[PDB]
Design a protein around this ligand. Sequence first.
Ligand SMILES: [Cl-]
Lengths: 226, 222
Amino acid sequence: QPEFDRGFLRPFGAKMKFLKPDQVQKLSTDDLITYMAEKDKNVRDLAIKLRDAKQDSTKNGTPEIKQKYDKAYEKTKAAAEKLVSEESLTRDALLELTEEQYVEKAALFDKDVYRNNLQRQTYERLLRSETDVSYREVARTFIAREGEPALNAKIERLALTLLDYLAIAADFLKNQANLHADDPELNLYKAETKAREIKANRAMKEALEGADKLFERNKILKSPDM
Amino acid sequence: AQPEFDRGFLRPFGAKMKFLKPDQVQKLSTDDLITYMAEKDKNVRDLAIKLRDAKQDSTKNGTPEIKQKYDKAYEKTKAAAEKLVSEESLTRDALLELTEEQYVEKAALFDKDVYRNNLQRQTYERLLRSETDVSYREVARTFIAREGEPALNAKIERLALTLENNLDYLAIAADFLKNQANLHADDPELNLYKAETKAREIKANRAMKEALEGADKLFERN
Ligand SMILES: [Cl-]
């Protein structure tokens, strides 16, 4: 009786298995692909392409199809190996990473960093999408009551004092809430953004603290006898 | 300078809203009632903008074809604004025909706090729907990857069948996420959806409770 060929992926809902970077370095190439595919969506997408290539090669082993598998396997192995490369795990290389790259790396080796990283990613995504929703709604109301040249002038005043569309849009929405403290739409955006920023900063703090514990950055100093 | 933008019946951006009880609004002039309702209702607002553009075209070119368009645009705004305060819609009998939403949406026009609570409720409800979509799409992608697309299709079909036997995408999507969360308590993506939905539902329920309480206290004053 046939099941479902998952390849290097694990069954849906399976509790993830985390190991310290040294223990992961000791894994077989196959076991490493299984480990990384479960935690990183790039290694997963590559393992799916490797699975389809393995299926084609089994059915018909023509040199065109067999090398398509060889390439697919190599690409997955290269992606998985890069995430645990000794070069990337040096104290020097870990200092060079951004807070985001540092927590995304730690999230592959620690359960709590993984969860905290997932939370920060949803709060940061909603910070961005809610700024665009609000801006496009508030700009429509602004143009209706003040005209489009008046808006372009305000956006110009912001771009002339200060980067990307979302940074200028969030500053516009904040400045207008400070100028009109009685507008419920602007004061709801203001309140909701403050609450989203609090949640994103706490998620990042938790993930960074967990990353420091994992990479052993939190216990460098020991006092001797004075 | 003198660069005065033709606002029409609209007020300056960010202007503090003026709220009156339904009896006081019934006593307003047709022009004052349009100003009152275009500030609070987006349908009356969109019509007032159409009325402003029609008045501008009629001034630019007063053809019988264009003068007829302004008159029609003014009466459409007049009717829409008048309907929101019609005596027949404010009777206890007519207010009971209204859904909790509609009742709160009507009261929002006459009370400041009901307006703020109605706005909060609308944001939290919108995010409840869009976050169910984001999660479903994420969890479905991982499900298909590990179990296959026929396996998902069978689950969605059984869910669509229990629902159609008595369609609603978000209803089906929520039920799928709920069932999977109950089956797999250790999946971080499903645990995050569950936790985030609970926190948002709490916020959405509080906003609608506070809005209904104010809506009751408003239609209580008659
Ligand atoms: Cl299900």
